[PDB]
Amino acid sequence: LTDLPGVGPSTAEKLVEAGYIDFMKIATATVGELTDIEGISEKAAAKMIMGARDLCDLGFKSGIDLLKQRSTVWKLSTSSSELDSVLGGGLESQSVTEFAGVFGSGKTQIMHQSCVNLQNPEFLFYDEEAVSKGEVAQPKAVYIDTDGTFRPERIMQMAEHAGIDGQTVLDNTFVARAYNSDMQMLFAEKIEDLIQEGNNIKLVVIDSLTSTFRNEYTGRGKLAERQQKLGRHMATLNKLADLFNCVVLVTNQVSGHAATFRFFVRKGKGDKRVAKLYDSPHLPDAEAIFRITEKGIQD
Numbered sequence: 001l002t003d004l005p006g007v008g009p010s011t012a013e014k015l016v017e018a019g020y021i022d023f024m025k026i027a028t029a030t031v032g033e034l035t036d037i038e039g040i041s042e043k044a045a046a047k048m049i050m051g052a053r054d055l056c057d058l059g060f061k062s063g064i065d066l067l068k069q070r071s072t073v074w075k076l077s078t079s080s081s082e083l084d085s086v087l088g089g090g091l092e093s094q095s096v097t098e099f100a101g102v103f104g105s106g107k108t109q110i111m112h113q114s115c116v117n118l119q120n121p122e123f124l125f126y127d128e129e130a131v132s133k134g135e136v137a138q139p140k141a142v143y144i145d146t147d148g149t150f151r152p153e154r155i156m157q158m159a160e161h162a163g164i165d166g167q168t169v170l171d172n173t174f175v176a177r178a179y180n181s182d183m184q185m186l187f188a189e190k191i192e193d194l195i196q197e198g199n200n201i202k203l204v205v206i207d208s209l210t211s212t213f214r215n216e217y218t219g220r221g222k223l224a225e226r227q228q229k230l231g232r233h234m235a236t237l238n239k240l241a242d243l244f245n246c247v248v249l250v251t252n253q254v255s256g257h258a259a260t261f262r263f264f265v266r267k268g269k270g271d272k273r274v275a276k277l278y279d280s281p282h283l284p285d286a287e288a289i290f291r292i293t294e295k296g297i298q299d
């Protein structure tokens, strides 16, 4: 850290204690976050930020460099052919993909499946020139359980069928049981901590994303405070997916908020499931049919 213009040994200690350990968190910080450190004047705060930006090289980019930026994105297989396809390859990192369906349409199932697929090295698609094996080594997932529907059996099961060790998934998956929007949001914010503890967090799950809010703010008259709270949570989720190049997933049950990829899932006949991609930045709307069996998502 002392590499940063103005930053010395003492200051370095302050910054590391306030959460700012790496450059990108400093290069993308606001002169406010940093000054609120006390001892970190608005003067030095601007200087270290101008600097951290430079080192990380956050300027204007054009031509072929734009493709280089877009290749730092890796994807995760959902274990469905039609779904990965509709996904344009699979679940993207640096973005928040949301599955919003009806009761028992499969949201939680897709969530579990992903935790498992993360421990299957072959299920992460990327360009090795922009994303080295080391970056995706010992990936771990954080599962913020809102409804209390995390089921370790179901993990073990999906693993066994995938041909991998379920105990290995359980060992690399952090589950946090949230009972309300405060715990939910906080757990989310506390993820940056597991990463500084040396945890290669690459998958984040919020099941559900919109449950606690609806319950805490049913009053459709105090909607403001709510939508603010929820939107601020999303901002954290996105920033989190960008800076730590990791896939973030959220579920939303339905019979407004930011989410870079929007899916609407519904039950079919029996196993059959219909996932409808109605919103995304570069892909056309489309439907993906898959199913859920003892093996998880398949076809």
Ligand SMILES: Nc1ncnc2c1ncn2[C@@H]1O[C@H](COP(=O)(O)OP(=O)(O)NP(=O)(O)O)[C@@H](O)[C@H]1O
Binding pocket: 101, 102, 103, 104, 105, 106, 107, 108, 109, 110, 147, 149, 154, 157, 253, 292, 293, 294, 295
């Ligand atoms: N071990 C299993 N073997 C076969 N099917 C299973 C298994 N576990 C769960 N399912 C299927 O998963 C369905 C439930 O899907 P689920 O992931 O709970 O949807 P959901 O989006 O979470 N619904 P909700 O939480 O109520 O909003 C069941 O009704 C089963 O068909």
Ligand SMILES: [Mg+2]
Binding pocket: 094, 095, 096, 238, 241, 242, 260
């Ligand atoms: Mg993004």
Ligand SMILES: [Mg+2]
Binding pocket: 107, 108, 147, 149, 207, 208, 251
């Ligand atoms: Mg659910």
